[PDB]
Every structure is written in C-alpha cells, then in structure tokens.
Design a protein around this nucleic acid. Structure first.
Ligand SMILES: [K+]
Ligand SMILES: [K+]
Ligand SMILES: [K+]
Ligand SMILES: [K+]
Ligand SMILES: [K+]
Ligand SMILES: [K+]
Ligand SMILES: [K+]
Ligand SMILES: [K+]
Ligand SMILES: [Mg+2]
Ligand SMILES: [Mg+2]
Ligand SMILES: [Mg+2]
Ligand SMILES: [Mg+2]
Ligand SMILES: [Mg+2]
Ligand SMILES: [Mg+2]
Ligand SMILES: [Mg+2]
Ligand SMILES: [Mg+2]
Ligand SMILES: [Mg+2]
Ligand SMILES: [Mg+2]
Ligand SMILES: [Mg+2]
Ligand SMILES: [Mg+2]
Ligand SMILES: [Mg+2]
Ligand SMILES: [Mg+2]
Ligand SMILES: [Mg+2]
Ligand SMILES: [Mg+2]
Ligand SMILES: [Mg+2]
Ligand SMILES: [Mg+2]
Ligand SMILES: [Mg+2]
Ligand SMILES: [Mg+2]
Ligand SMILES: [Mg+2]
Lengths: 181, 124, 260
RNA sequence: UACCUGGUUGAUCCUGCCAGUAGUCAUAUGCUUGUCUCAAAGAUUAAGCCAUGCAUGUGCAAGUAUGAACCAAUGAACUGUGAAACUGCGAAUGGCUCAUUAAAUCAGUUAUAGUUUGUUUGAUGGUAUACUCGGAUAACCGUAGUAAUUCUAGAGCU
RNA sequence: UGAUUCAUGAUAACUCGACGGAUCGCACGGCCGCCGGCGACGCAUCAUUCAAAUUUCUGCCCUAUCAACUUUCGAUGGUAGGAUAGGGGCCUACCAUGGUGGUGACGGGUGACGGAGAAUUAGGGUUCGAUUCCGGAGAGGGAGCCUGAGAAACGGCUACCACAUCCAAGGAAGGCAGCAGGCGCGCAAAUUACCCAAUCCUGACACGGGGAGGUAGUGACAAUAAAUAACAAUACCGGGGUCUGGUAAUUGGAAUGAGUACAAUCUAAAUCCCUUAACGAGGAUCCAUUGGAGGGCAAGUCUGGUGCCAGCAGCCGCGGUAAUUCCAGCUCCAAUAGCGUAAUUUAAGUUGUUGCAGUUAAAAAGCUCGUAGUUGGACCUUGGGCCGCGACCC
C-alpha cells in the first residue's frame, strides 16, 4: 500500500454537450473578454461551482422550512455567499442563491477586483500584475488571479512591499537601464 | 535587516526535560535565517547556557517570502539532549559523527556470515 | 489467516482516535489488556497525539521507558497498552492525573482530576458467580477479578474501587433513576438518568435514558455505565456535562464566541 | 442543462434504425508538451518461466563466558565491556496475486447452553542433599571425509 | 440465566500426571545465627483481552436447445459408537426411505474472487468492481505432514507429476502470484536506487531488524493551479472638429518568470518545492499545438494542382477539367498545454417499474377449457361534547 493513494482529487469543470452552438460560443467569448480569462475552462469551472451551489440550494428548497437540515445547511450556504460578496444583505434567503450567475462569481476574482480598484488600467493588466507577484491580499502576496476575495479582505488588496509599485526596489529592467546609463 | 523571533505552541516537556515550541521567524529583506543564527538568537532570548542544547528543524519559508516557520527544542542540559535527541539532529548540531555505511553491503555480509558457524564468522 | 493479526491499518483504526488519513499506512494496534481494542485509547495516542508530550513513536517509547506513566496506579511501559473508560492516567512528575471519559461526540477526553479523586476508579460488574472452592467472585468489564464481593452486588452494577488498597469501597445498584453515561453507540458520552428498563426475553435489553435538559434516548444494556446514585454522578464530568448539543446549537455557540 | 441533429421521398407525415453529439479513478495509441501541486503504474494475454542481489532475525541490571577477546585494575570463584555458542522467542504478521470458487466465498444479522486461544490484564495456588542433586552437550580445541552445500563423521573440555 | 441434571459444594474411587520454583538482578537493613525490600523470569487454574473455528436468517450474473436430481461406494433422517478443540453422515455399524425441484432443483457458461465501492445518472436506472480497506483463497500442479498457542506454512519439510540448476557423473540443490530486475506473451505497464528519519510491527529488546513502509528515479494513467505578454506614444482605421474604440516585426521605456545560480532552507543523506544575491526578453526565434473549414457542426462557393485517378468520407456524400469536400498555399474556426484515433454510460420513452409497442409500420396464440401464478364487489365504533394540540366523557 502507498499512503499517497488515499489523497483525494476531483475534476473542476465539464465540457459542453454541444460544442459548436453559435449562441453559447458568443456568450462564453463575451464573458471571457469582459474578465480577461485565459480559456473557456476558467469559465466552465465557475459554471461547475455555480452548478454545485445551485443544486445544494435547490435540494434544501425541496425540504420543509423547519427541517433542521435546511435551517442548518441553508444558514451555512447563506453565510458562504455573504462571505464572498456574492449576495447582498436584503438577499438573505435561499431563493436568491438560486438566482446567482457566473457573472457574480467572476466579479469576485482578484483580477476583476484589482482592475476595479484602480490598481490596473485594464483587466489584462490586472492579470499580468497579479501573475507578476505585485499584488498582496492582506499581508499575503497572491499570484493566482482566480483568487476569490472575501468582503473582509477586499479593503486589504494592495501592492506588494517587495514590488517596485509597492515601495520596493526597481526591477531588473530599470536597474539594468540605469547601470547602462 | 530586523529578524524577529516568535515562539508559539510553547510547552515545558518535563518528561523529556526540554522546551518545545513553534518558531516563527520574520525576516523581511532576507532569504531565510539559517539554523545557526536562530540557535544563537534563541540562546540569547531564553538565556541558554550551553547553546548546543538548542535544536531547530523543519523550517519552511512561506510563499512570497518575508517569514518562515519551524520547530524548536531547547534541552535543559546537554546529557538530556544526547539521550533523547535523534542521532541525525545531533549530527546536524555537531554533537555526533555520521558513520558511513551501506545498508546493502551490511545485508550481503550478514547473509554470507549467516552461512558460517563459529568464530570464523568474523573472518568471512 | 493462519494466526493473529499484528498490524492495524490506519484506515481500519477506530474512528474516535481521530487519526489522520495520510499519517502513515499503519495505526498502533492496541495490545491485549483490560479494555477491548475497538473501545480503548492506546497509551501512545494519549502521549503523542493528545498530550503532545512526545512527537514521535520513538519519543513515546522514550517517555514510557522512563517509567513516568502510571495507568490506574501502576507503571505501564507498553505503548499500545489499551487504556479505557474511567481509567486513571497519572504522571507523578508533573503531578497531573487524568480520568478517561467520553465527550458527547463519542471521543475519549483526558479529564483532569484531583489527587484525591485519582485514588478510585468506577468499574462495571460483568458477572457474579462461584469460583473454585465455592468462593464467590466478581469480574468487571475492565478485566478485574475481585473475590468475596458484597453479596448485594449483582451483574451490571457499578463498584467504586480504591486503587491504593484494591478493594470495593462502595457500589451502586443498577436501578431506574440512577445517573448513567453511555459508553457505546451513537449516544456515547451522553449523561442522563434511567427512566425505565425494557426487557425482552432472549435478546438484548433496552435502557431508556433522559438527560438533564429533557432529551430522551435509548441504548442497549451493554452500553450503559452507572456513574452515580441518583442524579449526582460520583465522578466529575467534562465541560459538556454529558449534554449532547445539536449542530444548530453548536453553530449558535460558535457564532456567539466569534461575536465576543 | 429533465436537450437532440443529418440520413428512406418529386415533396409530406410516420415507424424505425444507421450516423453524429457528451462522459469514463478507461485502456491503448498518435501528435504535441514551458512552470506548480497531486498521483496510477506487468491486473486484462501467461496463477507463464526466471539469471543476480536483497525481502527475518533477535540481548536486558535481571538464563548460560575462562575466547588462548578488549579496556581498566593487579591474590583473588565470578572486575567491567563482551564476539561466538547453547537456551528463549519470532519467523502463522506483513507483502503479493485473483487461479479455483455461483447460497459457495461474501454482506448485514445471529449463536457457541458446541469449542480452542502463546500473549496482555486481574485474581488464585497448603496434604509430593535441601546451606541446593545428576549426567550430557555447544561454543572452544584438533583429527578428518567429500567436487560440492549453514553437506558431514570421530576425539578432548566445560 | 429467557432457558441447563448450571455455577459451585460433598462423597467414592481412578491416572504408571512433562503441574505444585534446586532460576536470575539491584539494594542490602533489622534483631542476635536468624529474619528482611524492590524487581526479573518461569509453572498451573479461572476470568479478561487478542482471535479463530463452526454456525442462524435473508440476499448473487446469464442459460430450460439443462426437468428431473441425490441415494451401490452418505444421499435424508434415527440409534450406538469412533474421531475432533468442540456441534454435525465428519466417519463407522445397524435401521428407516427419505431430501431438493417451474418460488427453476440438478446441470452448463462466466474473458466470475465477494463486499465497501466506481463510471454515468431529473427521477427511476444501466454498466463496472484484478488493484492499496474488510473478508476469502493460493504460493508451478496435486497430495501429506513436522514444529508450534496458532500452519495442512511453502523466502518449512516429504513424495509424485511438469519444468529446471550445478556435477569431478558418484551425487547435490530447487520454487520472484515479496522488492528490483530479466525472458516470454502481448495493444498494454517504471530503478537490478537510498533509508529505517516518519508510520508501525517484531525480538531477550529504550539499542537490532524491517524491498512492511518511506525517500528519490522513470512516469502527458488521472487530477489542480497557471506563462507564452502588459502599458504608452506616433501612424492608420475608426466610430462616438473634439471626444472615445480597435489596429502596426512602428517607436519607447517599464514588468516578470522560464532558465542559470551565490546562499540558506529542505532532507536520514541527498533532491524538488518555497525563499533569495548576481544574471536572465523584442520578431520578447524565450517562435503552441491538435483537429477542422458542404451538411450534421464553428469556420472559405479564395488561389494552384489532379481529373471517377489519386484520394477524402463516422453518415449523407465529394472526385469525370470552374472540386466550397482530394493534394497544397493563404485565410478562417474549435479546444488549448493539450488535442486526435481505436469497451461502457448517456442520448434510448430504441427494453419502457416510473415509461414503449402489437387493425394496416415488427408484433393478439385458430379456438375454448384448465392447474400453478397474478388479480379479486360491498359490509362491522361511529359520531358528539367537555376539559384541554393530549386527554376525558356520553
Ligand atoms: K483462518
Ligand atoms: K514461533
Ligand atoms: K455474515
Ligand atoms: K464433533
Ligand atoms: K447419527
Ligand atoms: K510458538
Ligand atoms: K523507522
Ligand atoms: K524497537
Ligand atoms: Mg433521460
Ligand atoms: Mg497475510
Ligand atoms: Mg455441576
Ligand atoms: Mg453422536
Ligand atoms: Mg477467474
Ligand atoms: Mg475487488
Ligand atoms: Mg482474471
Ligand atoms: Mg499490482
Ligand atoms: Mg486483501
Ligand atoms: Mg496458505
Ligand atoms: Mg509462476
Ligand atoms: Mg503447502
Ligand atoms: Mg518466494
Ligand atoms: Mg509466506
Ligand atoms: Mg513557447
Ligand atoms: Mg456553418
Ligand atoms: Mg483545403
Ligand atoms: Mg418503438
Ligand atoms: Mg404487409
Ligand atoms: Mg404487420
Ligand atoms: Mg375490497
């Protein structure tokens, strides 16, 4: 026996049943361009996560409002949706969880929030800035653009202290240029 | 730069006669603080008379740098450490010598000698 | 197989040990002893996983070979010694004494006890019958044989045993209205008073227990352990006081703690 | 995502299948392949055949030292540390494979008032030269045999 | 105890009883030679624990072109034994004639070890389950044993069958379905590495050992995250002169990791990662591919070649001189560090229990009776109030 065999893993996305439908291709490309995604799989995994959350919410809506599992798991689901900024305060019911779209999840990415915070000129500039290790959430630098930012962590998105845009020293391009000068 | 030491999960393990803790090292501007430098800083911090009673290991710098975490033991005296500490850590601290052996060679010699009986086993 | 198993695969270990899935291929197989393998907490687990005194298997060996650990007043050097319910674990160097009780989630918890309270354990009488020479003798579920027991003591009784003198100093008759702790099943660690005993000929006997807050639960006779005469248990209980909480109330407690 | 599309006719509506469309902790194969984490891996056919090496040995204060063994001491049975060997224990676990096997294995659920169980834990133990019995044997030692093997005989000790 | 002529006591005897300590360590004090502590090892009994063995009920794929099977020589039961750790046709002697079967016995097939589970699933379902957890079984095929608490053990023995090794021909030695590795077989699968540091097991044992197990190597099985550029200015195209957008191997400075590497960290020792000096981008050649472009089905009725040939084409079809389909170039499309090709699920309400059909598309037996099976008319304590959703009363 190898102990490593017991580590779990799973798939994060599915491919569409119809590969070449014009309407779906246009909608996916519109979302990808709006949020600077690297491929369709990044949107497909968000759709996969939304599908699992929606299935959970629907299954508790098909149970009584006194069923102790619906009180408990619906409270947990609402806490998770409020924690990541996916739901407002007035939207405090399991019904509103069913109304969530992949747009709501894509709007909470570190790339989208870095772009909307003014730190980057474009969504693609935000993507490169995050992948260049210039962005920290709290004290932790995050080089992963699909990072889902909590509302309590939104106000702590900032330039890295080791980055030239965050008080750090100049990068190798600038330093080499001044050394040439 | 300013290396700040922070001990967490601290306990005084009297059964093994040592102090054990989680060591959090904050080193902005440094790659990582070496184990020897941490030993000297811990000897200063905990007033350790013999700094060969300090053992730090399992260090891990976080993603993005600037800070590291590891585990540290401080033995009340050098005899406690030489009795309770694993040999490889003593070798790391210079309190022991690494005996260079090949396990496979030991196995082959053991089989060959098991084929023989008596005091002539040593000469085989 | 052609004989006894010597190894416990880590996946096949008791779930109340809370052993992690990737810590290795193996779990400590409990040695034979006073408690059953599936219902005990081995000494190595207590020393390394719970009390954090030792960090490795070898460190547990080092601690135990120093003769630092006494189980119910006696020094044990076996790491897989099957310490079980109500056992006293004493370390007469740090001056700490532990009674192995169950929390309401079915997991053994080392409960700190006073020095005087560590001088006795509670044992459950398994059977009373005549031994050799016609001498009456008592046996318990923790493997002890006591000769010349009080004739008023019957099976399923709880006796109070003084570890220093090794005699029954007091006992409790298994009756309706005595506070009990459930030691097996899904209600393990729950504390309540017996309301009635439903007997069925030829099969297991069902005990109906109601806790202090009014919740009612039922369990077999083999999973009930009397801990006090009336509504006052003879030992101290862990923080939960044997009152199981639903996950909603646990979430309420967590929310209140986070808010504070 | 509780989904269909092309194909029989001059055209139509059907039945109906063919083909397409998606998945596979599903295998192989092809092309391609920068970084991180994770991870299966001679099962399918041959439970076919295997060179070589390794996979099981083991010593505490506490069974037995007189190595012609080592360190330290220097009229005493036995200093200590101890190889070897006898004695004790283990090698019935683990690992591997899925050939046989279709109420059989196996699963849940029973039973032993139908039995065995080294070990652990607890308790128990009275009517059968003694200031302590006898004979061997290993290691050791030296005569060997055989092409040869932890193949093997004889002699002297304890 | 649900239940025992049970636990257990007493008595009479019995047995050529492997029982009832001729063992070891440390400390060694108290009384006048005698007593004396803490241990270790060992014997026996009961209990407990670790377990096994046997055992109750229910439950398994396809096949009737398998309808009878079992019973000399055990088949079903009974009696008395023997044997076994113990129940039992388990075996023996005698006796009786039973036992199973369309509610499918018996037989055959399985490219059948069983389960936990796995894939796909609106629900229902279909298919898989050699493999790390549990159970079973085997160690070339059979068979038989010794030791031992525990084995019908195979990294134990004995023999036969089949292979096969060394030989001085007299003999001797065998069992990788352990780890690695090698032949062979194949569509199909890695190193003859390091180590007990972790997990844990084992021994006289804190110490030895462990191809259990871990570490590294190979490894696009599978899975996760995630680069291959971003910005600005000129010029163009714009759109909404101005405003604002997209374009250029244009022009500029910024950014950075792939890589290299001090070092530290990692580690049993190494290594990788994480961290980090110095270095490391312009056609940022630090150059992304795999399939397609008639329809299904996203994307060309562009150019050259071939001319029912070569070829493509899952299917429908294309190709005979103007080929949107072949061979190419250009361009475009999909997915993207991946994608193409060659059992099973979905699609399939094309197996239908949910949920399909049977006048004419495939499909009502020629007709009736009839056993099993399946399915079977209505009828029997209702009201009522009170207290208070429980209870009560009439
Ligand atoms: K068995
Ligand atoms: K043995
Ligand atoms: K069963
Ligand atoms: K029998
Ligand atoms: K009989
Ligand atoms: K034995
Ligand atoms: K180890
Ligand atoms: K050991
Ligand atoms: Mg469907
Ligand atoms: Mg095994
Ligand atoms: Mg009797
Ligand atoms: Mg009989
Ligand atoms: Mg088979
Ligand atoms: Mg299986
Ligand atoms: Mg097979
Ligand atoms: Mg395998
Ligand atoms: Mg298995
Ligand atoms: Mg076997
Ligand atoms: Mg073979
Ligand atoms: Mg055999
Ligand atoms: Mg073998
Ligand atoms: Mg074996
Ligand atoms: Mg490239
Ligand atoms: Mg089209
Ligand atoms: Mg073309
Ligand atoms: Mg039809
Ligand atoms: Mg017709
Ligand atoms: Mg017809
Ligand atoms: Mg009716």
């Amino acid at each position: 026996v190898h102990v490593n065999f017991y580590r779990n893993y799973g798939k994060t996305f599915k491919k569409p049943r119809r590969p070449y439908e014009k309407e779906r291709l246009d909608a996916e490309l519109k979302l990808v361009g709006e949020y600077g995604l690297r491929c369709k799989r990044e949107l497909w995994r968000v759709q996969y996560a939304l599908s699992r959350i929606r299935n959970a919410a629907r299954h508790l809506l098909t149970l009584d409002e006194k069923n102790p599992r619906r009180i408990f798991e619906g409270a947990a689901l609402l806490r998770r949706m409020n924690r990541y900024g996916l739901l407002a305060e007035g939207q405090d019911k399991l019904d509103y969880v069913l109304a969530l779209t992949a747009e709501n999840f894509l709007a909470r990415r570190l790339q989208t929030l870095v772009f909307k915070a003014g730190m980057a000129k474009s969504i693609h500039h935000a993507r490169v800035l995050i992948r260049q290790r210039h962005i920290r959430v709290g004290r932790q630098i995050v080089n992963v653009p699909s990072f889902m930012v909590r509302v309590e962590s939104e106000k702590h998105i900032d330039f890295s202290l080791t980055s030239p845009f965050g008080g750090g020293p100049a990068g190798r391009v600038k330093r080499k240029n001044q050394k040439k000068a | 730069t300013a290396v700040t030491l922070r001990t967490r999960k601290f306990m005084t393990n009297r059964l093994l006669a040592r102090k054990q803790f989680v060591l959090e090292v904050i080193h902005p501007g440094r790659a990582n603080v070496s184990k020897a430098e941490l030993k000297e800083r811990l000897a200063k911090v905990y007033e350790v008379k013999d700094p060969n009673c300090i053992f730090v290991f399992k260090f891990r710098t976080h993603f993005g740098g600037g800070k590291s975490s590891g585990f540290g033991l401080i033995y009340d005296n050098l005899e406690s450490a030489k009795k309770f500490e694993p040999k490889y850590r003593l070798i790391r601290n210079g309190l022991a010598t690494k005996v260079e052996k090949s396990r496979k060679q030991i196995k082959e010699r053991k089989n060959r000698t098991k084929k023989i009986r008596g005091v002539k086993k040593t000469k085989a | 197989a052609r004989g006894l198993k010597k190894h416990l695969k880590r996946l096949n270990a008791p779930s109340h040990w809370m052993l992690d899935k990737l810590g290795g291929a193996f779990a400590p197989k409990p040695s034979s002893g006073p408690h059953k393998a599936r219902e005990c907490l081995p000494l190595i687990l207590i020393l390394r996983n719970r009390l954090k005194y030792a960090l490795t298997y070898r460190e547990v060996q080092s601690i135990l070979m120093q003769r630092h650990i006494m189980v119910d007043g006696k020094v044990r050097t076996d790491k897989t010694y099957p310490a079980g319910f109500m056992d006293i674990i004493s370390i007469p160097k740090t001056g700490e004494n532990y009674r192995l009780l169950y929390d309401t989630k079915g997991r053994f918890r080392l409960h700190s006890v006073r020095d005087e309270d560590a001088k006795f354990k509670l044992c459950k009488v398994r059977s009373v019958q005549f031994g050799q020479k016609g001498i009456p003798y008592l046996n318990t579920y923790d493997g002890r044989t006591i000769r010349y027991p009080d004739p008023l003591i019957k099976a399923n009784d709880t006796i109070k045993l003084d570890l220093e003198t090794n005699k029954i100093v007091d006992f409790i008759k298994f009756d309706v209205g005595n506070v009990v702790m459930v030691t097996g099943g899904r209600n393990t660690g729950r504390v309540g008073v017996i309301k009635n005993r439903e007997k069925h000929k030829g099969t297991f006997e069902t005990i109906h227990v109601e806790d202090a807050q009014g919740h009612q639960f039922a369990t077999r006779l083999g999973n009930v352990f009397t801990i006090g005469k009336g509504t006052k248990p003879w030992v101290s209980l862990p923080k939960g006081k044997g009152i199981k909480l639903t996950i909603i109330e646990e979430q309420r407690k967590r929310d209140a703690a986070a808010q504070a």
